[PDB]
Scaffold this active site. Structure first.
Site, PDB file in Angstrom:
ATOM      1  N   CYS A   1      -9.549  -8.673   3.181  1.00  0.00           N
ATOM      2  CA  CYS A   1     -10.150  -9.060   4.450  1.00  0.00           C
ATOM      3  C   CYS A   1     -11.423  -8.251   4.642  1.00  0.00           C
ATOM      4  O   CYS A   1     -11.572  -7.166   4.074  1.00  0.00           O
ATOM      5  CB  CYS A   1      -9.181  -8.875   5.624  1.00  0.00           C
ATOM      6  SG  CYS A   1      -8.882  -7.179   6.178  1.00  0.00           S
TER       7      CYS A   1
ATOM      8  N   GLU B   1       0.823  -1.208   0.000  1.00  0.00           N
ATOM      9  CA  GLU B   1       0.000   0.000   0.000  1.00  0.00           C
ATOM     10  C   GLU B   1       0.867   1.273   0.000  1.00  0.00           C
ATOM     11  O   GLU B   1       0.853   2.038   0.969  1.00  0.00           O
ATOM     12  CB  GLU B   1      -0.982  -0.002   1.168  1.00  0.00           C
ATOM     13  CG  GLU B   1      -2.278  -0.751   0.814  1.00  0.00           C
ATOM     14  CD  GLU B   1      -2.966  -1.431   1.990  1.00  0.00           C
ATOM     15  OE1 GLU B   1      -2.590  -1.172   3.145  1.00  0.00           O
ATOM     16  OE2 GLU B   1      -3.899  -2.240   1.752  1.00  0.00           O
TER      17      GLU B   1
ATOM     18  N   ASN C   1     -12.679 -11.203 -10.011  1.00  0.00           N
ATOM     19  CA  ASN C   1     -11.261 -11.167 -10.354  1.00  0.00           C
ATOM     20  C   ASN C   1     -10.944 -12.124 -11.499  1.00  0.00           C
ATOM     21  O   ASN C   1     -10.280 -11.748 -12.475  1.00  0.00           O
ATOM     22  CB  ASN C   1     -10.420 -11.501  -9.122  1.00  0.00           C
ATOM     23  CG  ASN C   1     -10.103 -10.261  -8.264  1.00  0.00           C
ATOM     24  OD1 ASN C   1      -9.175  -9.506  -8.547  1.00  0.00           O
ATOM     25  ND2 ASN C   1     -10.880 -10.058  -7.234  1.00  0.00           N
TER      26      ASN C   1
ATOM     27  N   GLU D   1      -4.262  -9.183  -1.415  1.00  0.00           N
ATOM     28  CA  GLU D   1      -4.767  -9.028  -0.052  1.00  0.00           C
ATOM     29  C   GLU D   1      -6.257  -8.714  -0.036  1.00  0.00           C
ATOM     30  O   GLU D   1      -6.712  -7.803  -0.737  1.00  0.00           O
ATOM     31  CB  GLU D   1      -4.012  -7.926   0.690  1.00  0.00           C
ATOM     32  CG  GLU D   1      -4.246  -7.903   2.182  1.00  0.00           C
ATOM     33  CD  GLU D   1      -3.723  -6.603   2.815  1.00  0.00           C
ATOM     34  OE1 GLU D   1      -2.482  -6.462   2.956  1.00  0.00           O
ATOM     35  OE2 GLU D   1      -4.547  -5.743   3.181  1.00  0.00           O
TER      36      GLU D   1
HETATM   37  O1  LIG Z   1      -3.978  -4.635   7.890  1.00  0.00           O
HETATM   38  C1  LIG Z   1      -3.729  -4.717   6.467  1.00  0.00           C
HETATM   39  C2  LIG Z   1      -2.286  -4.266   6.135  1.00  0.00           C
HETATM   40  O2  LIG Z   1      -1.921  -3.233   6.990  1.00  0.00           O
HETATM   41  C3  LIG Z   1      -2.415  -3.840   4.638  1.00  0.00           C
HETATM   42  N1  LIG Z   1      -3.880  -3.729   4.314  1.00  0.00           N
HETATM   43  C4  LIG Z   1      -4.577  -3.735   5.616  1.00  0.00           C
HETATM   44  C5  LIG Z   1      -4.668  -2.293   6.205  1.00  0.00           C
HETATM   45  N2  LIG Z   1      -5.895  -1.676   5.703  1.00  0.00           N
HETATM   46  C6  LIG Z   1      -6.020  -0.770   4.632  1.00  0.00           C
HETATM   47  C7  LIG Z   1      -7.398  -0.487   4.474  1.00  0.00           C
HETATM   48  C8  LIG Z   1      -8.139   0.384   3.518  1.00  0.00           C
HETATM   49  C9  LIG Z   1      -9.547   0.325   3.485  1.00  0.00           C
HETATM   50  C10 LIG Z   1     -10.305   1.099   2.618  1.00  0.00           C
HETATM   51 CL1  LIG Z   1     -12.096   0.929   2.690  1.00  0.00          CL
HETATM   52  C11 LIG Z   1      -9.720   1.988   1.707  1.00  0.00           C
HETATM   53  C12 LIG Z   1      -8.325   2.033   1.731  1.00  0.00           C
HETATM   54 CL2  LIG Z   1      -7.519   3.129   0.611  1.00  0.00          CL
HETATM   55  C13 LIG Z   1      -7.542   1.264   2.601  1.00  0.00           C
HETATM   56  N3  LIG Z   1      -8.001  -1.287   5.471  1.00  0.00           N
HETATM   57  N4  LIG Z   1      -7.148  -1.943   6.135  1.00  0.00           N
HETATM   58 NA    NA Z   2      -7.606 -10.969   8.189  1.00  0.00          NA
END
Ligand SMILES: O[C@@H]1[C@H](O)CN[C@@H]1Cn1cc(-c2cc(Cl)cc(Cl)c2)nn1
Ligand code: NA
Ligand SMILES: *[C@@H]1O[C@H](CO)[C@@H](O)[C@H](O)[C@H]1NC(C)=O
Ligand code: NA
Ligand code: NA
Ligand code: NA
Ligand code: NA
Ligand code: NA
Ligand code: NA
Ligand code: NA
Ligand code: NA
Ligand code: NA
Ligand code: NA
Ligand code: NA
Ligand code: NA
Ligand code: NA
Ligand code: NA
Length: 497
Positions: free
Chosen positions: A342, A235, A370, A340
């Protein structure tokens, strides 16, 4: 072998209960002769990947929806399916007694479970850790002499990965993603918040950070683990947001482009791990096709990029065709991979909902979409969480297909576990997605693929409340007469020869 022990927690469906001495499992795979199909069925009412068989007949009995296999219309080949061995996942698993641990690992990685063949491994800490750390927190160590693996890796993650691979029938591919660099490489001197690498691509900070990737791969190789691929940053866009709460490292697309071109690409190529693949983005597909345009139109970056990794969190505001589809159109030779997913990290979402059929449907629906838009693989987040959705040091508590209640030496397999398994168990690596033509508008989601041996697999998800009578036609075998019940998911398998 052993069936699901159902338990309800007040939501729409049941979990399956496992402990030290009992977990639901499959018999070894066995598939019937030409003219017969195998059907695996899961329902909200409680069926969990239950097996039945029937005829593929020459006569066409059904008068409703017809789904017609089109094996000559061939699309992408499949890399596989899996989940993330985070610090939080490994702590939850290792707090079970060893017999229970093995039932959990067999659930995911064995042929008597759902045959995972992908593990995502964070490079050092992320939010799903109990502390902040990198592999080289000792400052101004630009040669990374004090790079080292802590206890999280050497005691929790690596032993579990080793055990997953022993239990697995299919070869398992490991994928690594970093969240933050050492903070003395960062403009903001912190593990989180808005900050990037100091300086500019090619300089000492960028060269040190690329060297960190090689140091990580060396460390794991010393433990006899080798990686299929790494991502350029988990990210990267999050690290551009003021006050971002957990481990991040911000890159603009242009900054990712130049870092790969000048630093990460060449350093990986100049290493003994040059065969490890590099995936870009590793982020919400809303950033597509733009991020692909910026990175991949630069030939000095593009020559190092094997594919594009996407996260699902913004799938709902970014239709697949405008993002995955337009990206495949512009760059048809760069694979798309879902790295990823969840449920439970958005607000309003309560973290863990044991037995939630709705969250299982979200998984299979996303996987189907997907697959229909060229994605070669789909990777869950935490393999296991506690009943609160943790541990997580910023309390970003979320759901997981397996919930571990250590105080009872017990774990629960959610509907998400089985919705994923309808894919991971029956679509081996190298399967190819082929055409499946719907004869009329319908409410189902379906996808067809062909195993490397030419046999057929079709997944049919019904997200509606109504039973839908259904016929599946294979032009070379005949007609499969069936019904997709309301709130069900089916996987069909049949020989074609
Ligand atoms: O825990 C996990 C790791 O840190 C990497 N991915 C997870 C962290 N994470 C990111 C997001 C997110 C949710 C929305 Cl709705 C929009 C956007 Cl741009 C981001 N939600 N959770
Ligand atoms: Na999870
Ligand atoms: C373990 O699982 C089985 C399956 O329900 C059950 O009969 C048994 O009581 C459970 N308890 C323990 C402590 O193993
Ligand atoms: Na429930
Ligand atoms: Na048809
Ligand atoms: Na982690
Ligand atoms: Na780690
Ligand atoms: Na800390
Ligand atoms: Na260290
Ligand atoms: Na691997
Ligand atoms: Na990290
Ligand atoms: Na790191
Ligand atoms: Na997204
Ligand atoms: Na998983
Ligand atoms: Na097969
Ligand atoms: Na549906
Ligand atoms: Na169905």
């Amino acid at each position: 072998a052993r069936p699901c022990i159902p338990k309800s927690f007040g939501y729409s469906s049941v979990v399956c209960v496992c402990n030290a001495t009992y977990c639901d499992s499959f018999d070894p795979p066995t598939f019937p002769a030409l003219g017969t199909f195998s059907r695996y069925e899961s329902t909200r009412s409680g069926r969990r990947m239950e097996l039945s068989m029937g005829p593929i007949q020459a006569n066409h009995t059904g008068t409703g929806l017809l789904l017609t296999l089109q094996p000559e219309q061939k699309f992408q080949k499949v890399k596989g399916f899996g989940g993330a061995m985070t610090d939080a996942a490994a702590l939850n698993i290792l707090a079970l007694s060893p017999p229970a641990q093995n039932l959990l690992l067999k659930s995911y990685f064995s042929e008597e479970g759902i045959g995972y063949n992908i593990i995502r491994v964070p490079m050092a800490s992320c939010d799903f850790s109990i502390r902040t750390y990198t592999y080289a927190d000792t400052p101004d160590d630009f040669q990374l002499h004090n790079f080292s693996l802590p206890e999280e890796d050497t005691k929790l993650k690596i032993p579990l990965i080793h055990r997953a691979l022993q239990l697995a029938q299919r070869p398992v591919s490991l994928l690594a993603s970093p969240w933050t660099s050492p903070t003395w490489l960062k403009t903001n001197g912190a593990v989180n918040g808005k900050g990037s690498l100091k300086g500019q691509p090619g300089d000492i900070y960028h060269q040190t950070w690329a060297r960190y990737f090689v140091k990580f791969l060396d460390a794991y190789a010393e433990h006899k683990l080798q990686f299929w691929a790494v991502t350029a940053e988990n990210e990267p866009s999050a690290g551009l947001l003021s006050g971002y709460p957990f481990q991040c490292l911000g890159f603009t697309p242009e900054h990712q482009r130049d870092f790969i071109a000048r630093d990460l690409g060449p350093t990986l190529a100049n290493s003994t791990h040059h065969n490890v693949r590099l995936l870009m983005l590793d982020d919400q597909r809303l950033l597509l096709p733009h991020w692909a345009k910026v990175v991949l139109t630069d030939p000095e970056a593009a020559k190092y990029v094997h594919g594009i990794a996407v996260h699902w969190y913004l799938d709902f505001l970014a239709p697949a065709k405008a993002t995955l589809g337009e990206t495949h159109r512009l760059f048809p030779n760069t694979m798309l991979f879902a790295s990823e997913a969840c449920v439970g990290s958005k607000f309003w979402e309560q973290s863990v909902r044991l037995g939630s059929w709705d969250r299982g449907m979200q998984y299979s629906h996303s996987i189907i979409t997907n697959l229909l838009y060229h994605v070669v693989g789909w990777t869950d987040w935490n393999l296991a969480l506690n009943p609160e959705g943790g541990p997580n040091w910023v309390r970003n508590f979320v759901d997981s297909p397996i919930i571990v209640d250590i105080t009872k030496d017990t774990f629960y397999k959610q509907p998400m576990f089985y919705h994923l398994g309808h894919f991971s168990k029956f679509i081996p690596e190298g399967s190819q997605r082929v055409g499946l033509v719907a004869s009329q508008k319908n409410d189902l989601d379906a996808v067809a693929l062909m195993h490397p041996d030419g046999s057929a697999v079709v997944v049919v998800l019904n997200r509606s409340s109504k039973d839908v009578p259904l016929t599946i036609k294979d032009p070379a075998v005949g007609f499969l007469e069936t019904i997709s019940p309301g709130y069900s998911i089916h996987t069909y398998l049949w020989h074609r020869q």
